[PDB]
Every structure is written in C-alpha cells, then in structure tokens.
Amino acid sequence: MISLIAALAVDRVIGMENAMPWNLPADLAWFKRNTLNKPVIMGRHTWESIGRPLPGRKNIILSSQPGTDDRVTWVKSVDEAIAACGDVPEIMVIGGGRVYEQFLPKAQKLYLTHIDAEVEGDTHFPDYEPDDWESVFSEFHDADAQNSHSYCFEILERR
Ligand SMILES: NC(=O)c1ccc[n+]([C@@H]2O[C@H](COP(=O)([O-])OP(=O)(O)OC[C@H]3O[C@@H](n4cnc5c(N)ncnc54)[C@H](OP(=O)(O)O)[C@@H]3O)[C@@H](O)[C@H]2O)c1
Ligand SMILES: Nc1nc(=O)c2nc(CNc3ccc(C(=O)N[C@@H](CCC(=O)O)C(=O)O)cc3)cnc2[nH]1
C-alpha cells in the first residue's frame, strides 16, 4: 500500500519560499507516529529542508542527479523509488508537491493535517475529490500554548 502524508493550510498550500508561519509540534508528533519503522519517499527539495536523515525510517530521496549523502538511498525515478522500498506493508510518501502529484494516483490512504491558516504559498497538495475518499478517522484540536493554530487530523482511504 502507498500512502501520502501532508500538512495543508487553506487552498491546499503546503510550502512557500520561506519557513511556514506556524508552530505545530502536535502535528510533527503525529507525522512521527505515523512514519516510524516504514520507508519514506521524498523529493530532493524536501530532503534539503529536513537537513538530516529521519531516524528509525528507511529514507529514499528522488533526484535526477547523483546523491550527496550515503546515509540515505537516492533513486532517479518513481519505479526505482518503489523498488527501493522492498516488501513492506506500507510506503509513506512525505512530499513535496512534485512528489505528491506523481504518487497520488497510486495511493490508497491519505494522512492529512488540515491547518486553519491562510497563507500565500508557491506549492500545493494536489487537488483531490472528497467523494473518491472515505474519511475513516478525524480529530479536531484547538490551538494552545504550544501550537499556534487549530488543526484537524484526518485519514482517508480510497473508495
Ligand atoms: N506541509 C507539508 O506537508 C510539506 C511536505 C513536504 C514538503 N513540503 C514543502 O514542499 C516544498 C518542496 O516541494 P517541491 O515540489 O518544490 O519539491 P519536492 O517534490 O520536495 O522535490 C522535487 C525534486 O525531487 C526530484 N524529483 C521529483 N520527481 C522526480 C522524478 N520522477 N525523478 C527524478 N527526480 C525527481 C527533483 O530533484 P532534482 O531537482 O535534484 O532532480 C525535483 O526537483 C518545500 O516548501 C517543503 O517545505 C511541505
Ligand atoms: N503532517 C505532516 N506535517 C509536516 O510538517 C510534514 N512535513 C513534511 C516534510 N518536512 C519535515 C520536516 C521536519 C521533520 C522532522 O524533523 N520530523 C522529526 C521530528 C518530529 C518531532 O519533533 O516529534 C521526526 O522524527 O519525524 C519531518 C518532516 C512531510 N509531511 C508532513 N506531514
């Protein structure tokens, strides 16, 4: 099974030139819980923004160019990225926009964080049709002393 995981503001914004103007440790805890011990596939821009390998996960980076860090696995196409995952129950695709676009048609589950924030961005999660997906889990949280905005975790499974 292939799954996508993302945090989206309104209008599906997931990225901007500068750092996002939110602080959501609860969302990062959620991303951790849902990705540990599974292979994660990311594109090279997302790799550069994370800055290190994510512990406890097989990290697979898509790039057209030769790799620059032997601690992770570098692949040059989508088919190679899936092959590099091996025989696992669930592959986690962690972005960014160009990567989500290519993997959406293959995905059976979406793990989405919807954030109550309006921001101008340059990168969006792909458009998806709510009726093509079943909402199996949803939980809303208010902002608090640690988290700057309200947010809702949702898991969707493809109909
Ligand atoms: N809010 C969230 O959930 C979230 C999640 C992830 C990322 N983000 C944000 O999203 C932004 C980056 O997204 P993005 O679309 O610019 O970048 P991206 O998808 O992370 O990376 C794109 C890069 O991946 C490589 N690539 C992609 N598909 C490929 C293919 N089929 N074959 C070979 N290489 C391929 C290319 O690397 P080369 O250029 O080296 O060829 C490409 O330039 C940042 O703002 C980041 O912080 C947000
Ligand atoms: N829901 C969700 N939220 C995100 O912020 C997110 N970010 C990415 C890409 N960027 C990042 C950036 C940093 C870390 C990170 O440092 N995570 C650590 C720390 C978690 C914690 O502080 O609890 C990790 O071990 O996963 C992960 C992904 C992809 N999917 C996402 N999905």
Numbering used by the authors: 1 to 159
Question: Which of the paper's sentences describe this entry?
Answer:
Dihydrofolate reductase (DHFR) is a key enzyme that is essential for the synthesis of purines, thymidylic acids and some amino acids.
The ecDHFR crystal in this study contains both the open and closed conformations of the M20 loop. Because little difference existed between the two molecules, only the B chain is discussed and presented in the figures. The guanidinium moiety of Arg57 directly interacted with the carboxyl group of FOL between 0.1 and 660 MPa.
